[PDB]
């Protein structure tokens, strides 16, 4: 009945003086905008339909046209920035916010969805949705004794929209909006649905992606232990954002990093550092590098949890981007570690795989590795064992690489190479 109309028929119906004709034409628009292959968004916009849809959102008297127009506008708003802008320019934001209070669950849900697409465009529209007062009525929809009594699709859409209100930087969301949302987020983070859990974790990852003051707001809410629990989940879509959030937190202060250690995160790293998904290995190693950039007592926890052999493992064999994060983890470890911690590193076999990485055609990892060698030498000096170390590097082909690097395009590379050579070889 409302299948495969032309835009001109849609326009004719919507321009009729007849609410039922308008409803049928709006549903036909919804079906057009709902098809997988190239929905004619720009055609619908060019026909001048957005203002009509927006006015239909206000017809409390005709809940079906509210729904159909909400869905049509949702799909227009899901398009390019310019398409989302056309929806916002039509006055849709306050109209959708009014629909959050609808007695019809399917209509409020659609308003939630539409607002998520709008906010999802970027920080300006995100902040404009917030200024129009979206947060209170959204949070009210989740103010129930037990989340499990809500429809699953409904709760998933709400969680997703809230996560978009937490998303993007330049600038990050308003501090007071974040404080307003966080308690609900913490509660969703304890829900049992994997998709709600995944999107909640993503939201927490966005909020921890910034300066220490932002990390602190989250850490203060006591969520780190739950994040560490989620870090051990079987579902990759949960582990990925849980690990991103943990990684973000350890870019903060040593005290913030310690909360992650206290929560038990390190015991999960044997698995993460050998995870068959390369993204996970890379991000786990990145996280380790910011832990080895901390205090000597924190480095010692890395040692105690048996994680140095896992770092040697990743340095020995991994996707190259992971190997680069491992090199960083090693340079950090050697920069900040005691002599005894640094010795331990050598005994775990760090030298050969470090040397093997010197043949990389990546200038930055070479600098990083050379720096590690210097720090390791520095430690052997304090023990008067620099000759034993020189032989080791000599015996595994390390010297051939360092000597050959003396004649290298980069300046500080050739500098460090020649320095190492003359100072120790």
């Amino acid at each position: 009945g409302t299948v495969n109309w032309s835009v001109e028929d849609i326009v004719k119906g919507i321009n009729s003086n007849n609410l039922e004709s308008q409803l049928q034409a709006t549903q036909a628009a919804r079906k057009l905008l709902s098809r997988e292959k190239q929905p004619p968004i720009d055609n619908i916009i060019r026909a001048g339909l957005i203002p009509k849809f927006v006015s239909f959102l206000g017809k409390t008297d005709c809940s079906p046209i509210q729904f159909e127009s909400a869905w049509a506008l949702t799909n227009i708003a899901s398009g390019t920035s310019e398409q989302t802008k056309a929806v916002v320019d039509g006055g849709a934001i306050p109209a959708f916010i009014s629909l959050l209070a609808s007695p019809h669950a399917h209509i409020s849900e659609q308003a939630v969805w539409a607002l998520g697409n709008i906010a999802g465009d970027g920080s300006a529209f995100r902040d404009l949705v917030i200024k129009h007062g979206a947060i209170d009525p959204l949070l009210a929809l989740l103010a129930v004794p037990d989340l499990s009594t809500l429809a699953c699709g409904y709760l998933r859409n709400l969680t997703w929209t809230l996560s978009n209100l937490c998303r993007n930087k330049n600038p990050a969301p308003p501090l007071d909006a974040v404080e307003q949302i966080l308690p609900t987020l913490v509660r969703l983070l304890h829900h049992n649905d994997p998709e709600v859990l995944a999107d909640s974790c993503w939201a927490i990852s966005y909020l921890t992606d910034g300066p220490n003051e932002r990390i602190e707001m989250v850490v203060k809410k006591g969520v780190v232990p739950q994040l560490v629990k989620l870090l051990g989940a079987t579902e990759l879509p949960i582990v990925t954002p849980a690990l991103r959030a943990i990684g973000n937190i350890v870019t903060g202060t040593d005290e913030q990093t310690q909360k992650v250690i206290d929560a038990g995160a390190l015991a999960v790293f044997p698995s993460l550092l050998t995870n068959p998904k390369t993204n996970i290995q890379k991000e786990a190693t990145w996280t380790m590098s910011n832990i080895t950039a901390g205090r000597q007592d924190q480095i010692q926890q890395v040692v105690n949890h048996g994680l140095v052999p896992f770092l040697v493992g990743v340095l020995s064999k991994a996707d190259f981007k992971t190997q680069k994060e491992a090199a960083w983890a090693i340079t950090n470890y050697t920069s900040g570690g005691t002599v005894e911690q640094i010795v331990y590193l050598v005994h775990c076999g760090i030298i050969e795989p470090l040397m093997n990485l010197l043949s990389a055609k990546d200038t930055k990892i070479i600098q990083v590795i050379l720096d590690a060698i210097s720090n390791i030498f520095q430690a052997a000096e304090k023990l008067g064992e620099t000759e034993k170390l020189s032989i080791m590097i000599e015996e595994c082909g390390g010297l051939d690489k360092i000597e050959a690097l003396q004649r290298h395009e980069n300046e500080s590379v050739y500098k460090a190479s020649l320095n190492l050579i003359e100072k120790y070889f």
Binding site: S34, R35, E36, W71, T74, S78, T84, Q110, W113, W202
Partner: peptide, 10 residues
């Protein structure tokens, strides 16, 4: 990472 934007499809 989640989609920034999602249409509701048939």
């Amino acid at each position: 990472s989640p989609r920034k934007k999602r249409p509701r499809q048939t």
